[PDB]
Design a protein around this ligand. Structure first.
Ligand code: MG
Ligand code: MG
Ligand code: MG
Ligand code: MG
Ligand code: MG
Ligand code: MG
Ligand code: MG
Ligand code: MG
Ligand code: MG
Ligand code: MG
Ligand code: MG
Ligand code: MG
Ligand code: MG
Ligand code: MG
Ligand code: MG
Ligand code: MG
Ligand code: MG
Ligand code: MG
Ligand code: MG
Ligand code: MG
Ligand code: MG
Ligand code: MG
Ligand code: MG
Ligand code: MG
Lengths: 60, 67, 258, 144, 184
RNA sequence: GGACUUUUACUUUGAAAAAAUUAGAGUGUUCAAAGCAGGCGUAUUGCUCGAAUAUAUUAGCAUGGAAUAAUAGAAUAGGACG
RNA sequence: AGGAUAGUGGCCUACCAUGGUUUCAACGGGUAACGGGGAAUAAGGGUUCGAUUCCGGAGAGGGAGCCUGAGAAACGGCUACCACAUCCAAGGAAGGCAGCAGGCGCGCAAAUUACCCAAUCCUAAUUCAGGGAGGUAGUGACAAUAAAUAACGAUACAGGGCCCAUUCGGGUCUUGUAAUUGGAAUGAGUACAAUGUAAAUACCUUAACGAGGAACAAUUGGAGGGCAAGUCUGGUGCCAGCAGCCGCGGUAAUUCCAGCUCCAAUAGCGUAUAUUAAAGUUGUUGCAGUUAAAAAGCUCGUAGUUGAACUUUGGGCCCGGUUGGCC
């Protein structure tokens, strides 16, 4: 069976990916404040309620 | 804050019944300076190896040191 | 293994000592004495954990070695001397007198007694025999040997002991209508006025026992200690006098006096 | 009467019948025969250290066209030869040869998992450094 | 060879990890009561499960039973003492009918919010954590305190704290130092 | 004390079944896991509640029941009462 | 019957008999088997584990033997042999860490050659001495408990009623967003002190200092389904790789590598292995057997399991307990 192969191709895509450096964002709070902001982002500010309240929409 | 207190009838009774650590904590007695436990045990184990006073052994080895 | 044990770990001690499960790996093993170590109370735990007169075994030893405490008239300057049922403890300092009796929960109570009551104790005879040269003798529950008893004193009777000399003042027999103390088992601590006993020749003679509130139960003959006839006892009973209140009426009384 | 005995004095029959029909199982028979203790490379352990012999380009099963980049490794305690699949992309360039690797099961309890024909183990650490930390370059490989 | 310290777990994770009903219900609870994890809700549901199990195995026994009478009265008394169970409801089935918001309504966080010294449950949380509270005359910095229905008459600010006097405070003293520098 | 005394199984109650652990009563470890502590006074001399209870198989022991399932008896009457 | 034992006993010896166990599982083998109290998971029943804090055994490298002593077949006591192994001026001598630290190995896998008898207890001739038993501290994300990582304002937009119902003007009271801005609050962390403790280190107290973000910055795993959360962007092009399972990838990838966003749990999260529930896929409760796996070819038949009905019932008369019942 094919026990051989092209071992020169290991890491091909991981090497070919252009290095995109992470943008620096405002610090997101941790803990009770985070649960508070999730509660506001889901319930009182229900901003995206499109038909059945999707969470991560596509830009359309 | 909450603790435990003891008054005695005299400092004689206090010094015959209170522990020495609390006495030296109050500064009534002096904490005797002692060698460490390892050194005390090593001295005891060294003295276990001699039978008697050991003065005869000491003078015999001080004689035999030259030969 | 290989000989007698000299230690006693905590969680292996008898539970009626009320030794806390924390604060040390070991328990004070009672030395050999007049009582079994299970039905005993060392003077260390009696002085420290029941009376709070000391905080350490060092302080208990400091009390004992100056011959302050004496039990049954003898000084007994041993830290782990087994004090058992109905042993009297005299503290001439504070002129206090205790008698080791069980409370109804099954533990030893701090039953302060007077001096005329501390001048004696009761003993349950365990065997009557003929010693050497035909001398008759009895053996009480605390291992006391008393020679030349009254010939009517048979086994499972109670003798009153002079406690200065080892003589017998008088004695209580064993039959129906006698006030008893239960010393052993589930009903340890109750006081219940024998109605009758069943024999079962071959082991464990049972006795039926009904308290002042007519609540009957049954006990082996090993755990019964007759302390007089119905009504008057020969000793001072502790608080409660062995009723064994249920938990309901107990919390009712706790809500009554609060 | 539904087969089995129902009498009040027939517990022994039910016990031995249940014993035989318990032997008819898989996990019970395996646990009692001790195939992990006898016929397993790991000897019943969760992980095992070994010495890398070589690098294999094991083909995936059908329908899947890929090369899975596994290694041949000889276990230290048994001396048994074992094929272990090096998980992530480019991590074959960390395990070169005569490396002292840690292996674990793959999660299928001794079965070949997916499209990889006949391997049962994955590499976790190489030279005392974990492969995911090496892949995210939180650390780097030691001397040799 | 010493007696081992006893310990226990105080919560239990649910069986199904991801279901939207439980998820958004407990998120509403956490948002309304100012909690930081689902672990508090899990702990409260664990205590409620134990209480309901005790009520179930007491109700399996008939009435006039001493164990049922004793421990049912004890449990009812402990619940009406903490105030999770109203005084009229003392029939051992409302104990089964309780829910976790009844328990969460007795925490010191929401009790401070109801007393109005906070204006928000998160303000109550940080106040309790920053020791500006005294349930009797003793500071408590645990929000899950379960006040005992007699302490609300004594919930107030701590005497050795700002909003209780006796010292202004750290950054207040700092600002006094900076304005004394500007005074110079 | 006796003379004899059909045998069990089953079931009730009770004795016994170490403590720790488990369940569970009480109790401000500051909450809690815990622990078995503590609490109350004129605090100047002191007083006082506790540290329960339940479960802990089977086997063995005593006890009430006597349905259910077995067992034996007076039939070549060397049977009972007397 | 005798010896021996502290004593019973084929425990041993002499003589004599042919007995004793077993399908109700003897005997033998295996145990990755010290037993139990107990532990995990459990609607109930149950299944699995229990080297390990308590009890009871057995052992001191493998066997054997023995002195002393009340108590040992003792090993931090000797004697011999076997296996390892130490020092020698080679004649000889001394060995037993499955005690406390610690060191090699073995491994997937487990800490300081610290301080002290101050507590808990123990031993002695004994208040006083001793105790790596024990306690204290150090390492310690084995597990558990509690619980920070921000709160509240004012300004700028966008709502919902209500005063005006005077064009769409103010908007009171609002619930969110801000390359808007403020004073407060606080502990982590240092630290005089005191407390703490045998002496300390910590904890609880507490002077003084100690938030404004680029700080004092929360991770782990994932976003096709199961199963919470992308038809967003770039790269690759059945390659690299992902994927517990179904499956994704062959030039428009919601599954790969990245960025952005979002989701779940959170000082914890994932992975492997084993086990429990799920599993009524071990079925006593409680499985299935015509065709999916499974009625022996048929009958007899012992052990085993099970086994028809039948023997004092009914009627009365009283007594006294519990729950009620206005009173
Ligand atoms: Mg002793
Ligand atoms: Mg039957
Ligand atoms: Mg029977
Ligand atoms: Mg003989
Ligand atoms: Mg014979
Ligand atoms: Mg073994
Ligand atoms: Mg042991
Ligand atoms: Mg031995
Ligand atoms: Mg060894
Ligand atoms: Mg030996
Ligand atoms: Mg040794
Ligand atoms: Mg060692
Ligand atoms: Mg992430
Ligand atoms: Mg991924
Ligand atoms: Mg979804
Ligand atoms: Mg396929
Ligand atoms: Mg996916
Ligand atoms: Mg992605
Ligand atoms: Mg089920
Ligand atoms: Mg089936
Ligand atoms: Mg078929
Ligand atoms: Mg057929
Ligand atoms: Mg048959
Ligand atoms: Mg039959």
């Amino acid at each position: 069976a094919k026990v051989h192969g092209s071992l020169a191709r290991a890491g091909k895509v991981k090497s070919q990916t252009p290095k995109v450096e992470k943008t620096e964002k405002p610090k997101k709070p941790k803990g009770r404040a985070y649960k508070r902001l999730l509660y506001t982002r889901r319930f009182v500010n229900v901003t995206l309620v499109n038909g059945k309240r999707r969470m991560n929409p596509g830009p359309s | 804050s909450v603790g435990f207190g003891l008054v005695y009838n005299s400092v004689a009774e206090a010094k015959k019944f209170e522990p020495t650590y609390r006495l030296v904590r109050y500064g009534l007695a002096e904490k005797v300076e002692k060698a460490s436990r390892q050194q005390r045990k090593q001295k005891k184990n060294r003295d276990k190896k001699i039978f008697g006073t050991g003065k005869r052994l000491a003078k015999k080895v001080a004689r035999r040191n030259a030969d | 293994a290989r000989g007698p044990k000299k230690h006693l770990k905590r969680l292996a001690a008898p539970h009626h000592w009320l030794l806390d499960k924390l604060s040390g790996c070991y328990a004070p093993r009672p030395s050999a004495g007049p009582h079994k170590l299970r039905e005993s109370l060392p003077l260390i735990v009696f002085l420290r954990n029941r009376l709070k007169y000391a905080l350490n075994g060092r302080e208990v030893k400091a009390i004992l070695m100056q011959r302050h405490v004496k039990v049954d008239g003898k000084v007994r300057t041993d830290t782990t001397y087994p004090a058992g049922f109905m042993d009297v403890i005299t503290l001439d300092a504070t002129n206090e007198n205790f008698r080791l009796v069980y409370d109804v929960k099954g533990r030893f109570a701090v039953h302060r007694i007077t001096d005329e009551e501390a001048s004696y104790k009761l003993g349950k005879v365990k065997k009557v025999q003929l010693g050497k040269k035909g001398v008759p003798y009895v053996v009480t529950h605390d291992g006391r040997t008393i020679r030349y008893p009254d010939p009517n004193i048979k086994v499972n009777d109670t003798v009153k002991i002079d406690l200065a000399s080892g003589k017998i003042t008088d004695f209580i027999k064993f039959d129906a209508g006698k006030l008893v103390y239960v010393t052993g088992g589930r009903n340890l601590g109750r006081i219940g006025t024998i109605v009758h006993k069943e024999r079962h020749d071959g082991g464990f003679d049972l006795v039926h026992i009904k308290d002042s509130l007519d609540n009957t139960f049954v006990t082996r003959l090993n755990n019964v200690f007759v302390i007089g006839e119905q009504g008057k006892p020969y000793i001072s009973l502790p608080k409660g006098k062995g009723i064994k209140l249920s938990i309901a009426e107990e919390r009712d009384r706790r809500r009554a006096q609060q | 009467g539904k087969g089995k005995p129902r009498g009040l004095n027939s517990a022994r029959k039910l016990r031995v019948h249940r014993r035989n029909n318990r032997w008819a199982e898989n996990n019970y028979k395996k646990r009692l025969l001790g195939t992990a203790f006898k016929s397993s490379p790991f000897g019943g352990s969760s992980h095992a250290k070994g010495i890398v012999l070589e690098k294999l380009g094991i083909e995936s099963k059908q329908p899947n066209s890929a090369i899975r980049k596994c290694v041949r490794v000889q276990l230290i305690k048994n001396g048994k030869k074992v094929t272990a699949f090096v998980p992530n992309d480019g991590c074959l360039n960390f395990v070169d040869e005569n490396d002292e690797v840690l292996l674990a099961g793959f999660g299928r309890k001794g079965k070949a998992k997916g499209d990889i024909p006949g391997v049962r183990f994955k590499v976790v650490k190489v030279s005392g450094v974990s492969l995911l930390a090496l892949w995210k370059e939180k650390k780097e490989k030691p001397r040799s | 060879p010493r007696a081992p310290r006893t310990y226990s777990k105080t919560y239990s994770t649910p069986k199904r990890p991801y279901e939207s009903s439980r998820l958004d219900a407990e998120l509403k609870l956490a948002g309304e009561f100012g909690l930081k994890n689902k672990k508090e809700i899990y702990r409260i549901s664990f205590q409620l499960s134990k209480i309901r199990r005790a009520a179930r195995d007491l109700l399996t026994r008939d009435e006039k039973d001493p164990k049922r009478l004793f421990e049912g009265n004890a449990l009812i008394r402990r619940l009406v003492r903490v105030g999770v169970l109203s005084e009229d409801k003392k029939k051992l089935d409302y104990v089964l009918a309780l829910k976790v918001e009844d328990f969460l309504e007795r925490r010191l966080q929401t009790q401070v919010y109801k007393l109005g010294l906070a204006k928000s449950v998160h303000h109550a949380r940080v106040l309790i954590t920053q020791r500006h509270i005294a349930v009797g005359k003793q500071i408590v910095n645990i929000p899950s305190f379960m006040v005992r229905l007699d302490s609300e008459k004594h919930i107030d600010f701590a005497p050795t704290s700002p909003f209780g006097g006796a010292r202004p405070g750290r950054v207040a003293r700092r600002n006094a130092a900076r304005k004394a520098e500007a005074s110079g």
